[PDB]
Design an enzyme around this catalytic site. Structure first.
Site, PDB file in Angstrom:
ATOM      1  CG  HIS B 231      -1.980  -1.024   1.021  1.00 38.02           C
ATOM      2  ND1 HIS B 231      -2.813  -1.279   2.008  1.00 38.02           N
ATOM      3  CD2 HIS B 231      -2.356  -1.826  -0.009  1.00 38.02           C
ATOM      4  CE1 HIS B 231      -3.715  -2.350   1.652  1.00 38.02           C
ATOM      5  NE2 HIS B 231      -3.411  -2.641   0.322  1.00 38.02           N
ATOM      6  CD  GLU B 261      -2.513  -5.976  -5.705  1.00 41.17           C
ATOM      7  OE1 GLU B 261      -1.792  -6.846  -5.157  1.00 41.17           O
ATOM      8  OE2 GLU B 261      -3.420  -5.419  -5.098  1.00 41.17           O
ATOM      9  CD  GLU B 357      -4.412  -9.262  -2.440  1.00 41.40           C
ATOM     10  OE1 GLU B 357      -3.592  -8.401  -2.751  1.00 41.40           O
ATOM     11  OE2 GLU B 357      -5.585  -8.989  -2.128  1.00 41.40           O
TER      12      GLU B 357
END
Ligand SMILES: CN(CC(=O)O)C(N)=O
Ligand SMILES: CN(CC(=O)O)C(N)=O
Lengths: 401, 401
Positions: B231, B261, B357
């Protein structure tokens, strides 16, 4: 085995946004407060008090974040997802990371940071019920007490270093102004111009600061009906000649917000429009002179309302004349003491940074129907207010050809 | 001091995100929940729950908003500064506007929407203390009870309209992908690359959708050590060839979040990095095969952890394998009963939308230091799961020459 907490001291701490003295002074004051009220610790949860007292601006993604202040420590409490980043930013004494691997590891990083306390400071205007239930059951003895109100009136007054950063941000909001105007073209969609002015300001922030994070800076360019709300989102609306337009540019630097908002018209403006724009500019020029030390918020409002009543539009009006600056956004912050509204008896003092931002809005139907608003930022000093916003306002400039 | 509440029906009601029948189905299940709990009204204050139910996504700037939902009503409560824009979005029966002109007019508008209750249902994970104390004082006779847990679990299972929305947004994240790759040059600053991606995406959303509000869409594009937290904020670091990179692109459409991502390298990857990327890609292709109806979140964590442990890297995992999609962003939403975490035993069910992820992160200085992360989204169906993320992952394709 999956631990609840760690430390991730990865890479070097960055060059911070304010000096060390600046942070030391904010942390000093707040502790003079804790001490005066026999509050053992503050636990901040909000983006804007975390940022104000440590230079870390967190990303929530539905995880909790904390900054725990005692007389001795300043400890940031981050999620393991953020790695070393919360630590390389924090101006404090520690960083404890909690992990995902069990529920409510956050409240174990907390109880790690502050093993005992009889009186804890929390943000009543930011902490939610579920989290408060939580924290109370880790400390059933503690008294939990507000601190947000006391810390807001401490942020209400700006430092000199805060003033310099708000100057640079008003210079950038000026550049995003100019890039609005460049992009501005008959049949241009609103989002083309908003992309254009955004790129012009991210790119000056990048330029002026070196150890800067480039976040959340934005543009609201509103046209025609879409000027009926001062925060209405960007749409696909094509600009026509003669439509009422609203330019609003917001550089976000290190959690520090500044704004440029400006009525404009492409090609022409009609005289039903021009005459309401010229009433809105006259109240804007008036409030500029009203921003002085010793002025009370409430009175600035009533003083200004008489001008709009003289002109039979006081009913068009839509929101307070101005608010406070500092570390805030659309999603965090704002010093509620600090508002230019009819029942706020707050007196302006040197150091405060307030806007002046009259708005009138006429519904669709009426001649000159649309939102009008001009927004400047002043810094309250000795002797008056220094208006830091240099892009031109009103019809003598903002009818673009 | 001038009025407290008003209505502004300015302009036309927009074309909503979903079908009227999609909004009728959501508000019918909420009402079946409230009546079975004997709760007279729900008051939502959260971005997500107001968006979910009424298609209005508000802009806080430190003002409160509400959605009041009865058996007969759906009323939004928006501020006078937004003029007509809330009402044009609200899929409901009313919108009431509160003004700045006296303190806690917002409460005056709720008591207007909902003149009497005995049991009112509120969001404990969102509502703050101070507001909850003001609400309770309005309604002393009334029991305040949590509805956010009931609502999160309703949100957890998407309809087919939500599926098609989430396919659209993954498509545009694959467009934001290829613009990262377009933009990637040696010695490109992070921000330039972020800016080129997010322009790519804004313009795509603006093609696809009609009546759309263009807000919040971002990129995080991380290089070198800035890949150590998923982040982490864009900087002005320049990309060297060989640096470890992370591409993260997030279309935000009508409050609906999706994301791509990918690890990538420019021109080459060392040995040490390759070895670690191939582990992380190995655990990712296993996680894809474990996502199926019936599956427990707990059993999925704990099988992929066995893979990582077989390559002696498990201690480098930073956060949960993935979460629930729907209405969220970085600053609102997220269905906490939906997380691929070690102690979470929800069982995946058709209509869920989750990510996969995996990430490990090696601290500077270790060989292959950096953050590694692949991220796809999967719709759970009756037989398995459909993976919507089409951009390539791994070294075969993400070594960009
Ligand atoms: C920040 N906002 C003012 C307000 O919300 O009072 C603007 N400038 O439109
Ligand atoms: C949302 N975020 C995931 C998480 O917070 O667990 C991303 N994908 O990095």
């Amino acid at each position: 085995q999956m631990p609840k907490t760690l430390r991730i001291r990865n890479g070097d701490k960055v060059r911070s946004t304010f000096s060390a003295q600046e942070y030391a002074n904010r942390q000093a004051r707040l502790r003079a407060h804790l001490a005066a009220e026999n509050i053992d610790a503050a636990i901040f949860t909000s983006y804007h008090n975390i940022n104000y007292y440590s230079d870390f601006l967190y990303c929530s993604f539905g995880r909790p974040y904390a900054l725990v202040v005692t007389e001795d420590d300043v400890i940031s409490i981050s999620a393991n997802i953020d790695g070393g980043q919360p630590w390389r930013r924090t101006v404090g004494t520690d960083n404890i990371v909690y992990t995902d691997w069990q529920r409510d590891n956050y409240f174990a990083a907390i109880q790690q940071a502050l093993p005992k306390a009889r009186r804890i400071g929390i943000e009543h205007d930011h902490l939610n019920l579920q989290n408060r239930d939580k924290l109370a059951a880790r400390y059933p003895d503690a008294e939990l007490v507000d601190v947000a109100a006391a810390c807001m009136r401490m942020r209400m007054i700006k430092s000199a270093e805060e003033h310099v950063m708000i100057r640079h941000g008003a210079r950038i909001a000026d550049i995003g102004g100019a890039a609005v105007v460049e992009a501005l073209g008959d049949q241009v969609p609103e989002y083309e111009v908003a992309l254009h002015a955004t790129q012009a300001m991210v790119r000056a922030i990048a330029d002026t600061f070196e150890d800067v994070e480039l976040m959340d800076t934005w543009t609201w360019f509103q046209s025609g009906i879409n000027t009926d709300g001062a925060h209405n989102p960007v749409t696909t609306r094509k600009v026509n000649k003669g439509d009422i337009l609203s330019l609003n540019c917001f550089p976000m630097i290190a959690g520090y917000y500044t704004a440029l908002e400006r009525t404009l018209f492409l090609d022409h403006c009609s005289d039903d429009h021009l005459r309401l724009w010229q009433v809105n500019v006259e109240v804007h020029e008036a409030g500029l002179k009203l921003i002085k030390p010793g002025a009370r918020c409430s009175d600035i409002a009533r003083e200004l309302n008489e001008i709009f009543l003289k002109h039979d539009v006081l009913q068009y009006r839509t929101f307070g004349y101005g608010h406070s600056f500092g570390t805030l956004s659309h999603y965090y912050g704002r010093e509620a003491g600090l508002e230019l509204r009819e029942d706020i008896d707050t007196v302006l003092e040197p150091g405060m940074v307030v806007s002046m931002e009259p708005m009138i809005m006429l519904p669709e139907g009426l001649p000159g129907a649309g939102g009008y608003r001009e927004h400047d930022i002043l810094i309250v000093n000795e002797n008056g207010a220094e208006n830091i916003t240099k892009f031109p306002y009103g019809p003598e400039k903002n009818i673009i050809r």
